[PDB]
Amino acid sequence: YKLICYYTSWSQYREGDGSCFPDAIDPFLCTHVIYSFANISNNEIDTWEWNDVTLYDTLNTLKNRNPKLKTLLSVGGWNFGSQRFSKIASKTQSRRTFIKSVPPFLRTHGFDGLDLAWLYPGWRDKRHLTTLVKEMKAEFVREAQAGTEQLLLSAAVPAGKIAIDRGYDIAQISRHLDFISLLTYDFHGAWRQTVGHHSPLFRGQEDASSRFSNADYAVSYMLRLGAPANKLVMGIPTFGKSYTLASSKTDVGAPISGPGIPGQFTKEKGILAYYEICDFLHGATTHRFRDQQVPYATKGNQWVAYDDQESVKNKARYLKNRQLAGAMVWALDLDDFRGTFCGQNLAFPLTNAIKDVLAGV
Ligand SMILES: *[C@@H]1O[C@H](CO)[C@@H](O)[C@H](O)[C@H]1NC(C)=O
Secondary structure: OEEEEEEEHHHHHOOHHHOOOHHHOOOOOOOEEEEEEEEEEOOEEEOOOOOHHHHHHHHHHHHHOOOOOEEEEEEEOOOOOHHHHHHHHOOHHHHHHHHHHHHHHHHHHOOOEEEEEOOOOOOOOHHHHHHHHHHHHHHHHHHHOOOOOOOEEEEEEEOOHHHHHHHOOHHHHHHHOOEEEEEOOOOOOHHHOEOOOOOOOOOOOOOOOOOOOOHHHHHHHHHHOOOOHHHEEEEEEOOEEEEEEOOOOOOOOOEEEEEOOOOOOOOOOOEEOHHHHHHHOOOOEEEEEOOOOEEEEEEOOEEEEOOOHHHHHHHHHHHHHOOOOEEEEEOHHHOOOOOOOOOOOOOOHHHHHHHHHHHOX
16 A cells, blocks of 8 residues: 655644654654655756755655655645646646656656646646656656666646546546545535535535535546546545534524634634644534545634544545545644654544545555
C-alpha cells in the first residue's frame, strides 16, 4: 500500500503549537511525503516561500533515517490561479520550458518526483493537461537514462463528477501517472447554506439529487473511467469543516449563516485542524451520520463535520476492499502532529490509524 501524505509550507507560520516544520514528520509514517506547493515563474518550476530551499533540505534529510521514503514536490495549489497553468500548458513553447526545468530543480533539492496540483482545468484545458502529463512523463523517462531512479509523477484530482468530466481525461492521464490522489473531502462547504459533511464515504439516505457527493461515487466513477485501481489513491482529510448555525437546529439540513469561527491556531474561517477539533469536542455534542459513516459535533452556534480515528480506519478498510493503491492524507500539519491535544499522547493519530489498517489484513 501507498500512504501519501501532504505537508504544507505555510504551516510554519502558525503561532505556538500550530507551527509545523518538516522535521516534525515521523520518517516511517508515510510511504511518500509531498511538499505543497511550488510556484511556476519564468515558465519554470520555482520556490514559493522565502525559506523553501531550507525547508526542502529539512524534509529531504528525513531520508537519512528512512532511505526508502519518497518525497515529491507539488506544483500549483489553490493560490496558483488555474489560468496560470492553462497558459503554460496550452502552448508548445511554454510547456517545454516548464517540463525541461522540472528534473534539474527536483534533483537539486532532493525530490523523488513531481505532483501536479492544477486546481482546476477548464473544459478547454482537458486536452492540454493530457499533453502536459504525457510529455512530463517522457521527460522523466529520458532523464532516468542518466543513472538515477526515474522521477515519479503524480496528480491531485478533484472528486466531484462535474470537475472530473470538465477537466480530466482520466483514461489517458492514468497511463502516464504513477498515481492519482483523488480529493475525496470537498463534497460540502458553506456555499450550501445548510450543515453537511464534506467527506462522507456514502450518500445520506435522507436527501438525494446528488448521489455523486460522496467518496464511493467518486472512486467508482474513476475506476469506470479507466483509472486502474493500482494507481488510485483515496484522499482522507485530517481537517474538519466548520459552520455558524443560523438557528438552534443541528441535524440534517440545519440552516447556516456562514462558515465557522476561525481556529485558535489555523486562523481560517470554516476550517479546523484535528488538534483544534479535539479541543472543540470538550463540551460538545457528538453525532455520527450512520449512512455517510463520518462524525460531526456541535457546541454553541458552531457545527463541525470532521474525521476521527474510527472514520479514517473505516475509509482505509474501504479502499483496501476495493484494492486501491492506498490513501492520501491532507495534511500532516492538520493531524495532531504534537500528539498532545487528543487525550492519547500519540503524534499523528489519524495518519497512524490509517497506516495500521493498510499494513494489516
Ligand atoms: C510565483 O511566480 C509568479 C510568476 O513569476 C510570480 O509573479 C509570483 O510572485 C510568485 N509567487 C511567489 C510567492 O513567489
